Subunit: 347 residues, 4 copies
Amino acid sequence: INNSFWQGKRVFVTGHTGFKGGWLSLWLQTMGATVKGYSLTAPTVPSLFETARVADGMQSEIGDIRDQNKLLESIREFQPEIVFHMAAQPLVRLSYSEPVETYSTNVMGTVYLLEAIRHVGGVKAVVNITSDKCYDNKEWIWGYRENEAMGGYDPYSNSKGCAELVTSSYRNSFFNPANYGQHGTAVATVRAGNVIGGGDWALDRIVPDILRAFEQSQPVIIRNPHAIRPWQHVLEPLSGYLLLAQKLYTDGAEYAEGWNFGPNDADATPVKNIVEQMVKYWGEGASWQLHYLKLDCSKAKMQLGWHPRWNLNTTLEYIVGWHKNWLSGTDMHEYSITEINNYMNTK
Amino acid sequence: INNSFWQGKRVFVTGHTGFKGGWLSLWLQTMGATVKGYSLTAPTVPSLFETARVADGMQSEIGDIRDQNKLLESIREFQPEIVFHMAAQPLVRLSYSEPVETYSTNVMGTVYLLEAIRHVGGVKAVVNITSDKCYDNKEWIWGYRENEAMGGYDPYSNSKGCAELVTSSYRNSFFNPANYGQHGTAVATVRAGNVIGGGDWALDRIVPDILRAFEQSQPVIIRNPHAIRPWQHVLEPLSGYLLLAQKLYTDGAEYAEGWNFGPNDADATPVKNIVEQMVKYWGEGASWQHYLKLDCSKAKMQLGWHPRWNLNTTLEYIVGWHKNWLSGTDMHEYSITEINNYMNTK
Amino acid sequence: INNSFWQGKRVFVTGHTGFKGGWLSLWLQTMGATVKGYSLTAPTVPSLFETARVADGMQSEIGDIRDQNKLLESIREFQPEIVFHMAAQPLVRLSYSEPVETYSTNVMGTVYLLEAIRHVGGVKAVVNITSDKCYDNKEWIWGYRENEAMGGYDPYSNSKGCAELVTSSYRNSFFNPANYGQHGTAVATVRAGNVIGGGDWALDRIVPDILRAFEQSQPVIIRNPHAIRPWQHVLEPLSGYLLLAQKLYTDGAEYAEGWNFGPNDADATPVKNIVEQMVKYWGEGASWQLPHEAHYLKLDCSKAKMQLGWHPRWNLNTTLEYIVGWHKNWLSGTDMHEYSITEINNYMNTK
Amino acid sequence: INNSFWQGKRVFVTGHTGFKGGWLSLWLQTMGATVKGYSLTAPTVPSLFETARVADGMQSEIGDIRDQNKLLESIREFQPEIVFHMAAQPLVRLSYSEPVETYSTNVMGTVYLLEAIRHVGGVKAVVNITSDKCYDNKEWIWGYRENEAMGGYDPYSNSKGCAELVTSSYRNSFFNPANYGQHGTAVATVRAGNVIGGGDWALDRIVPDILRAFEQSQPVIIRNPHAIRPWQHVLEPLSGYLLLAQKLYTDGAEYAEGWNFGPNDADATPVKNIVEQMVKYWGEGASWQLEAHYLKLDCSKAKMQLGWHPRWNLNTTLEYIVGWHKNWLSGTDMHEYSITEINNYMNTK
Ligand SMILES: NC(=O)c1ccc[n+]([C@@H]2O[C@H](COP(=O)([O-])OP(=O)(O)OC[C@H]3O[C@@H](n4cnc5c(N)ncnc54)[C@H](O)[C@@H]3O)[C@@H](O)[C@H]2O)c1
Ligand SMILES: NC(=O)c1ccc[n+]([C@@H]2O[C@H](COP(=O)([O-])OP(=O)(O)OC[C@H]3O[C@@H](n4cnc5c(N)ncnc54)[C@H](O)[C@@H]3O)[C@@H](O)[C@H]2O)c1
Ligand SMILES: NC(=O)c1ccc[n+]([C@@H]2O[C@H](COP(=O)([O-])OP(=O)(O)OC[C@H]3O[C@@H](n4cnc5c(N)ncnc54)[C@H](O)[C@@H]3O)[C@@H](O)[C@H]2O)c1
Ligand SMILES: NC(=O)c1ccc[n+]([C@@H]2O[C@H](COP(=O)([O-])OP(=O)(O)OC[C@H]3O[C@@H](n4cnc5c(N)ncnc54)[C@H](O)[C@@H]3O)[C@@H](O)[C@H]2O)c1
């Protein structure tokens, strides 16, 4: 991550009012980038957006990505050189009760974003965040490789598989490598999941639910204790997104493809483990009661020189620290900035 | 194809004002089905819709499939037991010019249709027409199998790949074969391409262009003489769609998957040959100056489906249909007889 | 198939005393090629080898392909420009009772043949006959494509999958396309199955057994009347082998890969129908008396069609008519050497 | 790995005179197994076989696995319950000049072994060592999964792909999990590569050559400083082989398939760093002079179904390599030293 590269860059971020978007926006701000965000009002209360004062250091616009023209104008007005598309209906459970809204937001929203970029021009790098769930689920023990089939069982997962197809076609049709000397836009998709960190209040997700139980000194009710997942601190995939954006900007079409970001497998553990480790780090008032989808990230490692930095223990520790600070009244804007620095200064 | 099965069935057809939709609607009408169509105004002039008087024997509604509520009510008002979704922005060329409209129409339109079916209830069989182009193109000599990856280069092809994904998720989430005893809806997708026949006036389409030249007693100049495409008369895939619909209705979820329909590879012919045959079929006033394919073993083995007309026969009927159109023949009755001739084959 | 091309070509054929090998040898002879065969004594009595006088118009050597040096010498002595490797333990049933012999014959036999070719030099085209059974069986309704995985359940099928691997490695290591300008050898494998025709006296094979029944005016007993197999007249895949050989010779490494040869699936006919058609072609003295399979092994032959311009010539009915004809002429005492030559001519002249 | 399980077990090991075979034989001996080996004379001088006195505590037979009858009689005489097939022509380079012998040894040798087992009867577990190179090489960045295509460019790699096919057919035809209740034989294949450790004197091998230079106090000349290979101490895959053998014996056909064993990719290190660490570990007298992918395996199956996992990172492994070699040079009893190394491994985590 080259701080000097980000200084002064005009970066447009959809979904800046969310969990991942907030951390990314804060990170970009600390590196001196000129950032503009486009999202609906923060999805939860509390929210990282408000607690870490994400809006104060950037141009923040509230809008629906399904509003094709409003989005077009937002990008035209800003003239970004780099775009991170993170806005989406991210909940599986909810996708079952609101499938239409999930497809319109995740598929058409992506179409409208790419169309805006196509017409506005000048965008050098586009990083479209889809999901680790975009892959046709084979229900096997192996991590998915980027060249495998897109799909998805539930509307959310499937809409992300569709978003991947959309990005592929837009790239081939309007941002083709052979014509890169003309349009100059390098478009890529990034696939990652099981993101955890301080500031995520999407309760239905395990970690946020755990932290809420702990704060109330009430036992957290674990659904599937034996469920194994590849947990990773939110800054891990984000570091990959930033690294990729840099390569897309400076090197070009060579990196305009799909990319997996995830933790080392030897790190993955069952939810039972996560909770137990967290209980220890938290201390008093912490208790509980009662194959797997993963990605092969050899491509990011071999072609981007990417690698995670924090093991699960370090990650869970930072989580407890962040949440306890928030509860204690600490300035979470500065605290979050320091967390980014700690990550950045970890080698 | 049980002529008796279709009698009285309430069939809803999106895209009934188009080429394939018109032939399907006419076919359903001749078999005694109660048909309702939902489409935008016929895409061309002339059109099979008007020339073959498709609307006469059915309920015809003009509406946009992107209008979620209008579609919902149209289906609720009709209470169909069988649905054929054929409405879509079908042009590759146009998709490069209007990518957004292509995705909204082909992807969201399919989403709105399935959502309507989900809420209205009572639908027993759903046949969603996607495209032979829904497959991620490996650009090889082999015909694609139904279990291979979805994708698509251009917005049109890609939107069809997306439509396949959408249908798969809706089926798994809301019309799961495991819960068939509850919802009773068998949902499938059908993949076919290179459809030709009398009554198609889409521009830039090879066959229609050849006829456009003939009717103008002007020589047609071909640009790709060696190009091979698995051409098939429009009634060939439609017969497969009807056969599948019957199976979905009577047998159920066992057939709720994706299905390829296409001609036998041995029937594969280059355009130069196609032009020659057509010139010979037309007569005076006619002159001139790997490839994507599908493996249809599944339709054959599980549906007992199989093509009926070789390319020659198809080209002959194409010329017959068109020359008759120019001659002032009643194309509604002529088209009905064509369907009967097809049904009689074998 | 260019008859002119074969005139004077030195062709070495292993398995010339067998069913497919005999028809191929006879075909090569009629086109003026100088042929030498290397096989064990004909596998059955009667045999096409003896009934059609296969040896009379060629050099016929009896030897085991598992005898590395004897095979090397037989080849070095002959200096062939074209080689067709058809010798193998071809029975699945037997492979269960003699797995070791199956592997030694099909795998090491192929290794010894390729090694001999490597050292003798001068060979321009090598066509190694493996089997339609070389593919890892996915138990599905689709025809296999040449780029799919090799394997095999039983020792025979598996040994053929191994023969494919062996040929691939020998080509990559010693007959690499990148070095064609030096060695000049174009090596390929051909995959085909369900071959039928006059002159096959293998045991427990439906067509031959049907003829044996007709032969003794005994009703032919049928077990699974619904059984389907992509049957093809022996000359169909052989025409493909010859076409490929010519291309390997004249064009080179461009064709040094694996190739599928089979009939059109539209030709797929169950056994009951087959028996019925043969009963009709046979006439007086023919009759017949009585688990289902969801799928049957088949091949996708788009590659041969597109890249070689290959195409089958006879539907099953036509083929069955020729089968019955060949048999009764044999039974009547007809000169089967000349009869078989005419059959080859009829095939070449078809269309 | 259950020491009590191995006590008294009759284990037959082909290739016991080699590098991997010697360590495995020593390991089996320390756990109380009754071991018999069948190999050609040790391939090198020096050899682990002689230096670590591998033959002392076992029945050692010298024979060619291409001698179908001799191998048959060797197995019949011993009546093993567990068999580890490690004998093979393991060199890629040699396979180019001797392809026939490579195929005869690796393919027919495997056929003869399985045929012997088929007829002798009583064998409960068979672990056939093939190679990480049995996979059709796509030349990509991803680790191969057990369900992917067999193949191989060179005769050695290809012969291992063939050995996999042979084992699959023999299992399906004669040791089918469907009638395990009859034959009682659970047959599996194990795929692993880039094995390093004390006692390997194979020629033209990076680690052994580094030690050859160090032992002569001469700089080692490095020609491929950036080359990366999933190096692993010899005891790592062997622990997997032993664990699998136990499961095949006790649980049965459920484990009669192919299995990958390798190090974690996060452990991937280029030869330059390897030479550096080794120079540091050796000390006085050690010195050196100066593609976008590499063949690797996905070992999720071994992890998930066998509960297997690597125990030593590369650094720990290199330290033990240097230690083993320096002790050998110092006149240390390498039989006891090697036994202790096995114990150290068993004690890890
Ligand atoms: N957190 C994870 O574990 C995980 C796993 C896979 C994928 N993702 C993806 O990462 C992105 C960020 O997810 P997150 O965890 O921060 O979720 P989040 O809910 O905290 O953030 C989602 C953002 O999307 C915006 N948004 C949603 N619908 C919108 C619409 N119609 N118009 C405009 N903005 C809209 C929201 O306002 C919000 O800022 C999403 O694309 C999500 O699918 C997250
Ligand atoms: N004809 C072919 O060769 C071929 C090949 C592949 C796929 N298809 C598919 O078959 C179907 C029929 O194609 P066709 O050749 O008859 O084309 P067509 O253009 O003649 O018919 C298209 C129909 O779609 C309807 N439609 C389009 N957009 C609509 C919208 N927004 N709202 C409502 N109705 C709308 C039109 O009114 C028309 O009736 C399409 O789904 C097409 O993608 C056809
Ligand atoms: N006929 C089919 O339907 C079919 C299907 C797949 C593959 N094949 C393959 O085609 C080839 C020809 O089969 P076929 O039907 O003519 O069978 P066949 O039994 O009539 O001919 C086999 C030939 O192999 C020779 N042979 C066998 N073992 C030998 C050995 N050790 N040394 C030397 N020669 C030996 C025999 O002498 C004989 O000439 C074989 O490779 C067979 O596996 C045939
Ligand atoms: N060491 C590695 O990195 C690696 C990588 C892949 C595969 N392997 C496989 O692991 C096994 C052990 O290899 P290794 O490193 O110990 O090699 P090695 O050369 O040290 O041992 C090979 C053993 O094979 C025996 N052998 C060879 N040919 C024989 C024959 N014809 N008859 C009887 N015995 C014969 C030798 O006598 C020796 O004991 C082999 O199967 C090899 O292919 C090793």
